[PDB]
Every structure is written in structure tokens, then in C-alpha cells.
Amino acid sequence: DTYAGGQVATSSNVGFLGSKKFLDTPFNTISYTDKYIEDKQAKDITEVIAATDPSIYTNGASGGWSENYYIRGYASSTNDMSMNGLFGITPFYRTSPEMFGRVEVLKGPSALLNGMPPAGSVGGTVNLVTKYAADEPFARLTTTYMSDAQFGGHVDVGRRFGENKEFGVRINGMYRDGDAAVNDQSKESRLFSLGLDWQGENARVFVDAYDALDHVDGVTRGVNVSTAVGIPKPPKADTLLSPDWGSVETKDKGAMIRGEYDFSDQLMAYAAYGQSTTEYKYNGASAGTITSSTGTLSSTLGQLAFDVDKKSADAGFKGKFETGSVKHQWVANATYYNHTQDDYGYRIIPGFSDPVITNIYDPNPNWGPKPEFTPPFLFHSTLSTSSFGLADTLSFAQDKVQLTLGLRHQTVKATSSVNTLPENAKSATTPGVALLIKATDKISVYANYIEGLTKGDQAPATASNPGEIFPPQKTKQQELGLKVDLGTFAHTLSAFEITKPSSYLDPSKLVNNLPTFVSDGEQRNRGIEWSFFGSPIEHVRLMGGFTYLDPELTKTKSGGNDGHTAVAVPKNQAKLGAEWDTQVAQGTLTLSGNINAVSKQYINAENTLSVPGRTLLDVGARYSTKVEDHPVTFRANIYNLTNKAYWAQPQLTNLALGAPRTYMLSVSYDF
Amino acid sequence: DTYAGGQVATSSNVGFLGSKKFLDTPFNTISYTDKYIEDKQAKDITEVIAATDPSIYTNGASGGWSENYYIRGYASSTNDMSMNGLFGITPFYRTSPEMFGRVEVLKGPSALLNGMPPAGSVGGTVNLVTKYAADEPFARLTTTYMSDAQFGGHVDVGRRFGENKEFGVRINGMYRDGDAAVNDQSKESRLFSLGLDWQGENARVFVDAYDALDHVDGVTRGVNVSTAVGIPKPPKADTLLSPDWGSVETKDKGAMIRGEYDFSDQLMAYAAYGQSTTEYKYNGASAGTITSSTGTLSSTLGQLAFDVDKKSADAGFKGKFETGSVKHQWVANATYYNHTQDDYGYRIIPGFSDPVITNIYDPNPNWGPKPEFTPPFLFHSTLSTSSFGLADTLSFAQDKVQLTLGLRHQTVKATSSVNTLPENAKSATTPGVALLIKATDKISVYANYIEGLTKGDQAPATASNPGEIFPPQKTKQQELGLKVDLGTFAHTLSAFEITKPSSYLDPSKLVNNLPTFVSDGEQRNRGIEWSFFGSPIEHVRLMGGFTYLDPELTKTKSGGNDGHTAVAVPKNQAKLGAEWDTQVAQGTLTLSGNINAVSKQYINAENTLSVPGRTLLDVGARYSTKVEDHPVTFRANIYNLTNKAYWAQPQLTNLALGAPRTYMLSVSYDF
Amino acid sequence: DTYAGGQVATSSNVGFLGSKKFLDTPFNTISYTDKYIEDKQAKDITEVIAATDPSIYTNGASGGWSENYYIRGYASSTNDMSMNGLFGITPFYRTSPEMFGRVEVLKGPSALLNGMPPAGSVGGTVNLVTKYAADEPFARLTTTYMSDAQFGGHVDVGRRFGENKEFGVRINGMYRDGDAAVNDQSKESRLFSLGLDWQGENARVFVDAYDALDHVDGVTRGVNVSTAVGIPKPPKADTLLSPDWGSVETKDKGAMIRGEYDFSDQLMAYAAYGQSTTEYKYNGASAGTITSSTGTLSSTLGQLAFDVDKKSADAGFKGKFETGSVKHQWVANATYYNHTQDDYGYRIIPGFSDPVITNIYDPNPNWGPKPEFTPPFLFHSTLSTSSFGLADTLSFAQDKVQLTLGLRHQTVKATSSVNTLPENAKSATTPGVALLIKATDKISVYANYIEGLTKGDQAPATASNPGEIFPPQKTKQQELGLKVDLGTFAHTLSAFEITKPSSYLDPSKLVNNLPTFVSDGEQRNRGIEWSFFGSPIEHVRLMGGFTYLDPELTKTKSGGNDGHTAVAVPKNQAKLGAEWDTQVAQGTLTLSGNINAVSKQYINAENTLSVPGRTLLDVGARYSTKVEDHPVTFRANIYNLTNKAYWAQPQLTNLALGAPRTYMLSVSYDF
Ligand SMILES: [Fe+3]
Ligand SMILES: [Fe+3]
Ligand SMILES: [Fe+3]
């Protein structure tokens, strides 16, 4: 399954179409292996998928309250990841990757394939494939360090049972804790995970469960700027611009089961059910605001807790048939998601309502006392979605021309206990079509049209159309692409256009002498991507590429920002990761380097504030050997080697500092 | 004599008990070789004994007015090192290790073995073993660099003379000078040493003499904090928080002679005599005080000069005999120490009594003009100590059970030319017992009781018992331990409890309605130590360990701080040094790493101020080859490679910054 | 022609004496190859000639308005470089080295050999040798990075044509652009160069042409200090202490043609003609002035543009003959140089005459608005020089004793459109003599006397001798030296004394009771140099040395500064570059290090202000291999590894910051 280099896989899950090979997939897809994950010493999903992929962008801050990445220049919510194809299971805001055998990315929207994930983001789909027991018994201990003083370990054990090894058990345990690379920031993570499987003759069952904790002391929340004051030069990269006593914690627990049954080699049924819980707590700043070019910062304090219970299901049939010399491979499915949620919080903390005044350049800021965590209950809320989908792939001319057609019907309903406005389900129907031509056994050309869905907004009580709930809103993609597998090295070249609508109150459209709430907003992302992976010569691995992105606000409230560039995302990215192997005594030495170059990003939609591009370097070394015939691997990594200080745009606030120089060490031992 | 790896020796000097092997020593001991010293590029004793020993702690500042280390959580004064078993010879405050073939540490107090050293510290004994000429003629030149701009060299030459090579001459010369790694700090060091020996048939003589200079411009004195104001975040690690014009200089000259005479193979006499002089001069801050959380620093200035003339002697008899199936190995000795001293100084410098006001975060502090060095005479003082000791080691069962019993009488008298209060000698008797059992010839189990002595304090004129001089005060240790030599790798596991008394004026104990001066104070250090050294597999060296220490103030003035943790020392330490060798062309390449991790330390005895734990990394590379058949070694080291900024507690002031990232290069050539 | 190591050449151009080997040259000479240039990733000439040569000093600032270096402690103007032996062709202020096969240095003045270059500097002659097409067709692409975000590429292609490959074409293209290592400083460079040659039977023609751009945004201009205020501690090294909006741009275009004609093997004629244009523009600060010890900076603004059109020619004969057993090798030449120039500028910009007030330690300075570039015409000026020269080298004993004698007559005239005072040509005659003795074929001993010329000054209207124009002023050198070629490693040891006159109006020397304009000023530089290059052991390269310099102001106006040390230059330099090669897989791994240590430098001629010595470290790695038999080289370099912040003296202002830590990457591929 793994490609030359061991770092990328040759197939991925293309939503409900299932497992498809690189050259057979009319979408831009990549799948990273657990080997790559361990080689990066990746602590979250971002560190896996953003490192070498020029169609993915992160603001790159350390110890935020969530991960933050864009795919094809649109937000891709952490809420919207799948586990073994199923949504609503993964951790809410940050996921440590120890329990996954693959991390797969499908770029662009995919409503036909996947339906509408819970946060309705459209950038792309990240699918996390869990670990199951290999045939050979297995036990690996890894110890980890990260600067300044974060220590941890990870145990991974697998064994199969029964006379034909038809049962599997795979267990992962991980703990790490201590000060991180940012001043007064510490990071705690815990994971316990279970992967069980039964391989029957005509039937298969897979069970996965996990218990996870993510905790940051000195969480980074970021800061707001104005045009009046402007953006001052970034403090040094290890500065924390949020309260030192501020903290965030997320506890995530999840479990799922998949069953498959082969009726024949022309018909299979499958079902997947799962559930998860999230507990989020945050005590710290809601925002810092830079109020002077001398670096004065005004911070308001807030608290939030929320608890969410999630359930989800996906069941269907796959089959094959032939019509003359045309082979048909079809799938039909139904999906369900439900959550209930309680939110507690303060916008204004009693006794702590005055803003805390500091300066961004002060080495010893006074953040004041830490308020007790007592957020009062705010509201109960729910979300339900369901979908029914159908697709067929027609293969002509000895499978050299493959046409996929499908449609999905999607329903969604949200409720809130402080909403007096009407609450009603709404529905939309989303098609997709993809065409793939194998010009040779090494070269595929492909095109697709496909959509993404986002829950419709509700017009406020101040509108001509008060309380109107829009149907799910259609993001629309067209894509043309070329894929080349040279044998050990592979190239993708793809161009895309994706339009995403938005909704707003429009004063220019008067109905009963009132402003009308409309879905007339639009952002249009046009992009070219060239990317590559594998081994272009022996003992060398190379992964990366180049993208040009034009993210344009084509239609905005009152036309003010028509033709402007979208905030946050760069127009140009270039990324290269390279590894070089050489034999040294009784082992392999690998040297690694990464470069990550991006252009400037706008901070507001008026395009009157921006931050420059930056180029970041990383280096690593890896030594793999044996001690008394036990495999041993040593790994050292430095990220942001030049300790470049830069602003970039996080969620909810305008700016945050990128992560500083960070050292990571790990040693692993196979029992 | 040297253990596998070349870096540690298999025997050490156990006070007047003489040379004993690792498995035969009922104390926790380690001896480092000159090879280790050269490999660390150690510039002082601290860099030798603290690097991998988790029972030793230093605050780790660069360019202090002295070394500073604790052993088993108690101060071990630089004044209290021995040279070839004799006290009062070594440099007063800092010692560059070029002239030593071994640096030996015995952990815990050792009054029975060693008597009371001049400063009466009880943490451990550091014994410096000088170089003598090996049989083969020898000449090595080494050139040294340390960042930023310190250049130096060291010559080591030895030759033996006479027809049976019964005379030896060994000469060491060293100079280095230039800017160090701390801003505005420069370090000058000079050493000339002589080791002469004569090996007769029934007699031996050893002579050692040295002339040393230590000079620091921009000496670090450290800074004081209060509970009202608190401890601000450390400036960057290369900041100097003392006057840039401040300096310290110590000139040390010493010489000693040892003679041995064998009457038979059952009786030997020995005598050792030596003397030394110290000239200390300091012009700079007495203390910085942090007077605001913005980092305002108020620095008072002081000057000190003192001259001290020292004489030292140790003479006795050792013998063996048998009574039944019990072997006896006994010693009886007498020791003498005397110094005379003049002190000159200002507590208040005329024209410079106003503190200099700076801010600890200022890149451009104004330290004002440098006052002329004109300290006036303050007082003449003397210290005399003498002891008489007896010990016997009884061996049973083919030397598999060894019981040591001993006691020592200790006398001490101090005088001062400005003391109106009585001056009298005082005395104490200190016993010791140790038991060692060789379970196998690889495994020893041991236990000891032994004491340390400290000069008694004198009650002030304001007391109910005015002018009373206490006898030498007894620190008391109990220890249980286990040692294991696997062949090329060795373990020690030991547990200990050490109580140290203190004296104070007690307002709560009234006699004739006046406060009484009492010796009722107590600190109790309980510890577990696991440490190891050698080569656990081929081409690997590993040295380090783990300690837990509970240093508790069990009895304090008025009971205020009863149950508190002692200042300055961490409760937890983990240290690991590792080296890996590989063949590379015509030579051996060694890669090295060190980690040093400690937990938090309290800054006051009220335990209301503390500083966090910190982890420091070091890396090295070493290449040993030949050029035209002449051995050549290249050494490169980076210490504190993450350039971690941290506060820790020095002598006399509350806080000082740890040393920054420091680069060291050396090349050595054998003629 | 290249020495062991590939980095230095064995011959260089000794002015009109032509190509001479190392052991045949009675001057201190070195020639660096394009291989060395590529290995250093050199971006200007300074980075080639200053890195390892202890007789060369630069202040080392990043992004100045010109290069700045001294040779033997005297300014060597960038104006005064030669291209293939001809002056007035090279870029005016900064030269990127991509078009050169050699960079050659002759130390000390050389008027006999070279005449008077346009700026009349006397430190040394830098000669840049252009690239011509090798026999085998050639194409190399190189991509470059420099921190923070400067990217570039260089193409080098050559082919020969005709049946005997008697025509050659060699083309170089280079572009780089982006943010450099200094905050808010960007650097753009462009080069297109052409080297054409025809090799006939009796005759040869070489044509060279280039078009170059140098552009800096955030140009560093430096800052002035006073004795009243003093010199504060340097800000961090990547600080820009000139306006962020300030910029300099130079466009340089040049072309030259050389013809040679062999009349016989004993007589050759040659002629060279060339021209170049320079357009310089500068908009920014004229000076910052540090007006308080807290770091207050007062910056005045100015603008300058100048256009200069240059023409130059050199024609002559070389011949040999023998009379008895004495060989004669003679040369005779005539040289011409002319430039016309227009200057536009503001000393005071209308509407921007108020100084901009900042602080050198401010992370976020306000530099105010950028004034429109509108400098008005100031004056037209011209410079003409001509010379004729004759020299003979008399040799015997197979050239093992060589005596060189010569004379050159030099004429110069300057005009200016704002000079009312007389304008007249003036002349001087300058001799030279050198002696070389080959003690062996490995050892040469040599001595020389030779002069440098500088245009005479004109007495002001306030003098006794108003309007008098002095003749060309004679700098005078005497030198004694020793060269040793051991085979693969070479040494030079030389001692020199150079006196350089200056002129001033002297109130102490009255004629008709008026001050007299005199040439009574003198600076005298005495030096010892030990330097070396090549491979002392297999797989090692070593290049560097040590110099002591005594640069004394021996005679100054009024005698105030008599006996003081000259500004800007250190008295002591030590430089060492080392490379170590290891075979690994199918390629060579090279590791490199550089150290550069200098002593303190005076900032004023009163010698009441100075800045300390500093030591800088650099490290590098290089991997050279083949991919499908195509040569590939990877290079990584860090310069100023410790990121030392230091002041040094640039042109026109008192101080500027040295360049910060700078990372450089390049990859080259041969088609
Ligand atoms: Fe919120
Ligand atoms: Fe004192
Ligand atoms: Fe000027």
C-alpha cells in the first residue's frame, strides 16, 4: 500500500466511493503514513498535513485553543475530520496523531462523497485511519522531548488471536507534559486508544475507541489591530501576548463500530455507528487590542465551557454490474448525525471587567490575578443532519475512461434554548460528476464538478424577512488535473475554481421599508497546484510543491469590498521537504530539511492592513539501527530554525505570533 | 585503574583510610579522570563534578566571584577541597583543573576520615589528585577557544629520570584570556604547576606546587527580590545584571610535600605538609535589588580585599595484623591547619553610596563611573584547627565483611582583631562506623554512620548567655547503599538522612528576661540516589542518574518556617551524559549529548518565592586521529544549546542568571 | 593553474608585468577561483577577499550604499578595481562576482605596475578576471536562498565554435531579490554578462560586456557619535538604524576589448579599450546622530544622484632577449582614463529639514514619510589621467635571481563647473624596484620599493598660495617577504612600511602673514603578515593568517593628533578558514568553519572614542555528487553564527552595525 519512501500511501478513501488508487482518483488526494507522522514528531494534525502541502495554510501559532488550517484557501474546521470515513468522532479542536495509521486529505468540497460535516466547512476533508494489529506481535516504546521542558512517552502494542489470526488488538497510550517553546506556555496531552478487528470469511467488524486530553497553560488567543493605529513590528517569536495564567482544556472520548457483509462479489452491505463527547473549558483573554504604535495592549477577559454529546451513523450498499463493455461500480448510503450541547460563559467576568493594560514588547507584563472559573449556564443547543446518496462509476475501454455520477440529498436542523425565532429543518440536493482518463498506465487526466454544503444562516429580527432560515448553501468547485506516476516519484498538476456564498443584511434592498437578509455574498478561489512525492533517486525522498491562489471577494455587503483579496491566506506558497539516507556503521542516517515560503496576507477585507510573507526553515536527523537485534530509532528536529518572528491571522482575532524555534527529540525501542 | 570508557576510575581516597576500590568503599564515591576533564573542556571543578552527578547541584552562573555547588543538598565550600588528601592548599574560590589526574567526590560528611575543613561545610569532600610523570616521555599542546572571544593554550610535559625511572617531573602551563559568553564579561585564567616524585625501595616522596590566577571583568554578583515586588521574568541568558566595570581577581599559590616510610609490610608512617596564599580583590556591586515588577534594579557598591596565609599538616601511621580469622587495617593520624588573614573593604564606598539605578531588561544600562580601588584595613583574623583520629577496619570471611570503626578529636579556635568578646578553643569528638558486605565479587551492600563538623558560633552581647562559644556542631548522616559492577557498566543505589544543626538568638526562650542563643535549629535532608557509569554496550558511554531529595527545615527560629523546604536546591534531578563512537576514515568520531533536568527551587525559607525547574541540553563532537603518527584530538562543545534563560540561587544574593549558550573548541597535539 | 584544494590559483596579474607565478612574484598576492566564490556563496567582492585574508578589513555592515574594505590598513576604493587588468570598467560601488573566473589581490600600492586608478587609493589592487568558454560545452543552473527571504538564480553557459574551437561564447545571468537578514532591508541584484574570445594563430581578441543592478531598500548609512555623549551598547545585530523607506540603487554597464599580437615568441603588442556608465541614486538619511546615552537618534535626510561616463585604454609591448647569461623581460605601455559626471543632490531637502527623532533600541520606530526624489543639478565634473611606463626584469641562473626596475610618468587633470580657481594638468614620475631570490624551488625571498599616487589637492582662496594645485602625491612602500610552497600548502611571511601623505591649510606656516597650504601630513602603516593556503593534510583545506598593524598618524595639522592610531582599522587580525572532506556514498561531504578575530578600533583621530575587538564564527557544509552523471552541489552556510552585535566604522559616518546571523543555501546542477 505504501509508496516508495514509506511516507505516503498509494490509495485513500474517497468518501462513500471507498478506497481508490492515486491514478484512478479524479480528485487531488494525499495520504501520509504513521512512519511520516513519527518522522516529523508531529504533535497535531496540522504538523502532518501542512508541512509539505502548498494547498494547505496555517497561521502556525503554538498552543492556540484549536488547530487552524485552510485547504485551497478556505477554512477546514477541526470539527469536520472523519475517522475511518465517519464524522463526529474525532477530537473537537486538536488531535494528537498517535492512534492513526494514515492521515488522508481530499482537497476541495466533497458533499456528494461525504455529506455535510458538523461545522459545514468546504476547504477539504481530512480522514484519519486508525491502527489495527499487524500479523506479527508488536510492542514499541517511544520517549519524547520538546523544548523547553516537555517530556512524554508513547506505547504501541498489537497482537492478533485465533487459529487464523482473525481477531486483532492494537493499543496506544501516550502522555506528555511540561513547558513548551513559548514563554510561560506549557502543553499536556494524553491518549489511550483501542483498535479491535474481526476478519470473517464473508464479514468484517472494526471497533475503535479513544480517550484524549489536550491542555495548554498560557494559551495563545491573539490580538486585534485598527487602521488608525496599524500593525507594529512583531515581538520576538517566543513572546506570549495573552495572559500567562490563561488556560484551555479539551477532553475528548470517542468510539465507533464498522460492519461489512459480502452477499456476493457483486454486492456488499456496510454499517458504521459511533459517538463521542467533548468537554471544552477556557479561562483567559477574549481579545487583546493594540491601541498604540508604542505597543500598548488592552485585553478583555472571558470564560467559556461547553459540553457536547455526538452520535453518527453511515450505512449502505456497494455493488458491481456490466452493460456490454462498460463496468459499473455503485454505492448507495444513508447518514445521520446528532449532537446536544450546553454552553456556559462570561462575556464580562464580575470583579474582572476592567481591561488589563500591558505592552506587547514588555518582557515582564502584569496580567493580574487569575479569576476563579465559574461560568454560568447560557443556553442548550442541538444539531441534526441526515443525507441519502447514490453514485455510479462507469468504466469504458478496459477501464481507461472512468465517469462518476451521483447525487446526495441533505437535511439539517439546529435549535437553541435562547432562540425565540422559528426553528425548522431545511434541505438541499447536491450533484457531482468526475471524469478520469488513463492516457497511459502512468498518466491520468481528470476533471470534476462537485459541491460543498454549509448550514443556512437565519435572518435577524431586524430584517424584512425576520427569522427566515436559508437552505444549505452550495459551495461549487470545478477542477481540471493531471497525475503522473513515474514509478517511485509522482506529480500532480491541478487547477480549480471554487465559489462559496455568504449571507448578510443588505440595506440597499428594501422590503416593507426594511433591510433584507440575502445570500448574495460570494468568495471565489481560483488556484493552480503543482505537487509531488516519493523518491526521485535512490536514498532521497522529496515532497512538496507550489501553488498560486487568487482568493477574491467577488460580492460583498454594499459592494464596498468587491474585487478585494480574502483575509488570512497567502496568494503564493512554495514548500519542499527533503530527506537523504546514508549508511553509517550498523544503521541508516537520514538528514532532513524543510523550507516553507509564503507571500503576504491581508488582515482586513478592506485590504488596508496586511502582513508580509515569511520563509521558515526546519532541519532534522534520524538514526535507525539495532541493539541486540531490537530496532532502535533516534530522531532530532528543529522547527523554525531561524526563529523568525511573524504575525499571521488566527481564528476570531486579527493577529498572532508564529511558533518560535522549537527542538524535538525522540527515541523509540521495539521489544 | 580506569574503568571501561576511560572517564571514571575504579578507586578513590577515602580520607585517612587511603585508597579503596569502588566495591570496597562503604560510601558513595566517584572519581573522574583527566580524560573526562579534557573531553568536557572543563574550565572549573563544577564543570567536572556537576555535569552528570544528580546529587550535585550548581546555580550554573557564568563568571561568579566563586564556584558554587551543593552535595546531597548541602553547601560544599570551595575552601574545603583537598589536594592529595590535604586541606588548605587548593585555590580559595575557583580552580581550573589542568593540573589534576583525578577529581574525586565523596558524598556526605566525613569528619572521621578528613577532620574539619576550613569553612566547615558538610555536603561532601572533593579531592584533587595531581599529575605525576608516567614512564614514557610525554608532551601535549592544546589550543582552546570559548565564545565569544576567549583564546588560550595548555602545555603538559612529563619525563622520568634515573636508571630505574625513580624520579618524575610533570609540568603544566595554561593561559586563557578574552570575552566570555556573557555580555561585557571577560575571563582570564593562568596556571603553572609542578609535580615531582621520588619512588625509593621503602620510601616515597611527592612534591606539588602551583601558581594560579583567576580574573573576571563583569563578574556576576546576583540580585535580591522581595515578596512585595516578586520575581520578574529572567532577561535573555547572556545579560549581565552587575556593573560592566566590576571585577574580581584571585591569586593562589600553593605547595605541599608528602612522605611515606615502610618499616615493614605491616607498618607504614606518613607525613604531609603544605602551605598556600590567597589574594582576593573585588570591585563591584554588593547586591542588586529588584525594586519594581517593571524590572527596576537598585545596585549598591562595595569593595573587598583579603590576604590569607595558610599552613596545613597531616601525619600518622597505618598498619595491618591478624587476630584469629579477623584481619585488621588501622590508621592513627594528627592534623593541623592555621591561617592568618587581613581584610580590607568598604560596605559604603565614599562618593558611591547611592545605589546605581538600572532596569534588568535594558540593553544599554548606565553603570556609572568605576570607583578607584582603595579599600581600607578592617581587621586581622586567624583560624586554627587540629585533630587526632583513630580507625580500624575489621575484615571477616575472606574480606567479604568489612567493619570500620573510628573516632576523631577536633579542636578549633578563631580570633579577630576587632572582637572584644572572649576567644577560646573548643573541641568535639566525632565517631564513625561503616559496614560493607560483598554479596558477590560484583555486588556490595553497605551502611554508614558518620558526622560533619562546623565551627561553633558565638552568642552576641545582647543574649542571656553573652559571648558563649558553642563547640563544633555535629552534622549526622545515616546511609544505606548498594553497588553493582556488571563488568563495563556500574550502578550505585543509596538512601541517606543527614541532619545539620544551626544556631540563632531565640526571643521565645527568656533567661533573666533576655533572649537566649541556642543551637536548636535543624535541617534534615533525606535522599535517594541512583547513578551509573561506564559502557553499557560497545561504542557507547553512559553516565548519569536520578535523585529525589527532601530538604526540610525541621526546627527554625520561633517555629515560623518549621516543615518548609530548604532554599536553593531542587527536590528532583535527572542527568544523562552519553557518547557514541564510530570509525570515520583514519580516526574515531565521537558524538556526545547531555541533559540536565531539575525541578523548582525555593528562594526564601518562608517558601513564598520560588523559581521553576529547567532543562538544559549540551552537545559535543570529538575527532581523534593521527597526523604523521602524532595523536591529534579535535573537540567541539555547545553548552546550554537552547540558550535557556533561568534564575537560580547563588551565594549571598537571592538570584542570578544561568550561563547562556557557550561554544567551546580545542585542538590537542602529542609531540 | 589552480592549487591543491581548487580554491586558490598559482598565478596572478602583476599589473603591466602580466601573469606571474606565486614564487616568481616579489609582491604579496593571492588569487581566488570561481570555485571559492561559489563555496562562500559570496554576494560581493568583500565576501571573497576579506573572509580569510588578515591584511584586509571590512566593517562588515549589511546593505550599505557601497562595499568598504581596507588593504594593509589603507582604504581600497571600489572605484579602483581592474577588469582583466583595465581600470574604469567594473561597477562603481558594489560588484556581484558571478561573471569572474578569478578574484586577484595585490597588496600595497602599485603605481609603477598599474598607474593611478580613478579614486587614487593605495591599499591594494583588486583585479577581476572574467569567464571565457572552456573547450567542453557547459551549462550550470544555481538557485540561491539567503535569510530571511531572498531568492535568486544564476545561469552560466559556455560553448566554443569553429573547426578548431577558436571562437568562445560565455554567458552569465543572475537575479536575486527579497528581504535580507536585517529587519526591513531587502536586496536586489541583477547581472547579464558576455565573454567572447577569438584565438587566432598570431593574434587574440577578448571582448567582455555586462549590465548590472544593485538595489537596497533599508540601506544602512550609519550614525555619528560625540565624546560628550559617548558610544552606547549596540542594539541587536539585525536592527536597521537608518530609515526603513531609505533606498539606494546603482546601475552599471561596461564593455571592454583586448587585442594581442605575437610578432614572435620574444615580442608581443597588446591594446585594450573599454567604457562604462554608472547611475547612482540615494534617497534616505545623510546621518543619524546619537544625542543621548539612552539611545536617542537624530537623523537628517538627503538625496543624491550622479551619472558618470567613463573611458579607458591601455596599450603597449612586452618582449624578452638575452645578453650573455642575463635574461631581460621588459614591458612598455601607455594608459588613458577619462570620465564625465553630473551630480544632483540635496544637503537639505526642502520641506524635510527637521531631523527625524527615533531611539536606536525602539523595536517599532517611526521614520516618517519618504520624500519625493527630486534632487536638483549641482555641478558637472571631469577627470583625465594618462601614463607611460617602462619596466625590465633582469634574471639569471634560470630565473632564480630576478631584479625588476621601472619608471612611470603619470598625468592628471580634474575640472568642475563650480570651480572658479585655475584648472591645470599636473605630473609626477614614480619608480619601482623589486628583487626576488629562489633559495630553493620551494622557497622565494623578495623585497620591493614601490609607490602609489593620489591626485594633488588645490590650495583654498584663504591660503598664502591660493589656487596652487599639487602634483600627484606619492605613497611609498618598502616590503620584505618570504614565500614557501611545500607542494600542496603554501606560506607567505612579509613585513612592510607604507607612508601616505595628506595636505591641509596650516596656520602655523605663514607666508605674507597668511596660512600656507602644505603636503606635510602623513600616515605610516607598518605591518607583519603571516598567511597560508591549500591543503596541509589530505582531505583538509586551511586558509588564513595573522597580522599586526601599526597605523600611525605621524604628522597632523597643528600636531594635535601626532602619534595617534588611525581610525577604523584594528591593529591585530587572526583569520582561519578550514574545510574537512569525508567520502560518503557516491559523493564528498565537506564541513567548513571560519573564525575572524580582530582587536579594538578607534572611532576618532583624537583616539578618545573606540569600539572593542570582536570574534565572529561561520560554519558551512557542502555535498558534491553526481545524479545520472550530472554534477550536483548542495551548499549551506551560516555567517556570524553567534549573532554578535558590534559597532564598526563605515565610510562618511562614525559607526554602523555589523551584519547579523545570516543563513545561505544554494543548489547547482550541470546540464
Ligand atoms: Fe468565543
Ligand atoms: Fe562579602
Ligand atoms: Fe555624500
Numbering used by the authors:
A (entry chain B), B (entry chain A), C (entry chain C): 33 to 703
The authors write:
We incubated separate native protein crystals with preacinetobactin and acinetobactin compounds (both compounds preloaded with Fe3+); surprisingly in both cases, we obtained the same structure: BauA bound to a heterocomplex Fe3+-preacinetobactin-acinetobactin (1:1:1). The coordination of the iron is octahedral with four coordination atoms from preacinetobactin (one hydroxy group of the catecholate, the hydroxy of the hydroxamate, the nitrogen of the methyl oxazoline and one nitrogen (N1) of the imidazole group) and two hydroxyls from acinetobactin (the catecholate). The binding site is located inside the β-barrel similar to other siderophore complexes. BauA recognises the preacinetobactin through two direct hydrogen bonds between the hydroxamate group and Tyr312 of β7 and Arg253 of L3 and one interaction through a bridging water molecule between Asp375 and the nitrogen N2 of the imidazole, respectively. The binding site is predominantly hydrophobic in character with van der Waals interactions involving residues Trp97, Tyr125, Tyr314, Tyr378, Gly334, Gln335, Leu336, Arg379 and Leu684. Although there are no hydrogen bonds between the siderophores and the plug domain, two residues of the plug domain (Trp97 and Tyr125) do make van der Waals interactions with preacinetobactin. The acinetobactin molecule makes only one hydrogen bond (Arg253) and one van der Waals interaction (Leu684). There are no changes in the TonB region as a result of ligand binding. In the crystal structure, preacinetobactin fits into a complementary pocket; a simple molecular model shows that the same site would not bind acinetobactin due to extensive van der Waals clashes with Tyr312. The acinetobactin molecule is not itself recognised by the protein, rather it is the favorable coordination of the catechol group to the remaining two sites of Fe3+ that drives complex formation.
